Write a protein that binds this ligand. Structure first.
Ligand SMILES: Cc1cccc2cccc(N3CCc4c(nc(OC[C@@H]5CCCN5C)nc4N4C[C@H]5CC[C@@H](C4)N5)C3)c12
Ligand SMILES: Nc1nc2c(ncn2[C@@H]2O[C@H](COP(=O)(O)OP(=O)(O)O)[C@@H](O)[C@H]2O)c(=O)[nH]1
Ligand SMILES: [Mg+2]
Length: 169
């Protein structure tokens, strides 16, 4: 039938978590999407021959650590950790998100992909090599994306899926 994958997109405000998701779900680029709306979106795709139902939690809201919040996040099987290549602070925040993923999942090996989004923009303050260094230290893949042009958007989610497959062994 379908193999279900629960994906969770995390990272600072304004990096493109919603644009990335809606590009995958609805195939268009949203200029302004309510920055406060957190929701899960379901999508059927074929990845490497396998029919997949992706359940994608696009995170938002206040920073808080309620039990309900922890419980929503730890249903994630894999995580897209997203920063913008023109937002140094959002890159620096990646480690915090990874730490919270490890905590709620209670594991050192959680399927994860590092995503530098907005690669269409000229005002790059985060070097590709800087983000690669981080990704290699974590043992995770790294990919640059543009939710605006769709460059790399499919690959980023599919790569996460393949990371979940490897985790299952
Ligand atoms: C995200 C997450 C992943 C995995 C498990 C989690 C478990 C509990 C809570 C999580 N959340 C909930 C959401 C959230 C978390 N951390 C920060 O941290 C911001 C800054 C960064 C440095 C610390 N803090 C000062 N901001 C958040 N939100 C505030 C702004 C920004 C994004 C968006 C949401 N709107 C951590 C988890
Ligand atoms: N140029 C460019 N702008 C983007 C890209 N992704 C998102 N944006 C814009 O960045 C702003 C924040 O995007 P959003 O998806 O709401 O970020 P979120 O807060 O992480 O959900 C919006 O105005 C988007 O139009 C991208 O890949 N390239
Ligand atoms: Mg959003």
């Amino acid at each position: 039938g379908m193999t279900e994958y629960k994906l969770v997109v995390v990272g600072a405000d304004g990096v493109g978590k919603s644009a990335l998701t809606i590009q995958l779900i609805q195939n268009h680029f949203v200029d302004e999407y309510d920055p406060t709306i957190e929701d899960s979106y379901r999508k059927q795709v074929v990845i490497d021959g396998e029919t997949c139902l992706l359940d994608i939690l696009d995170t938002a809201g206040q920073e808080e650590y309620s039990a309900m919040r922890d419980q929503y996040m730890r249903t994630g099987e894999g995580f897209l950790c997203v920063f913008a290549i023109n937002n140094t602070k959002s890159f620096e925040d990646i480690h915090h998100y990874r730490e919270q993923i490890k905590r709620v999942k209670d594991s050192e090996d959680v399927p994860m992909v590092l995503v530098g989004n907005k690669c269409d923009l000229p005002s790059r303050t985060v070097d590709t090599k800087q983000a690669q260094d981080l990704a290699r230290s974590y043992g995770i893949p790294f990919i640059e994306t543009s939710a605006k042009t769709r460059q790399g958007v499919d690959d980023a989610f599919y790569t996460l899926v393949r990371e979940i497959r490897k985790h299952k062994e």
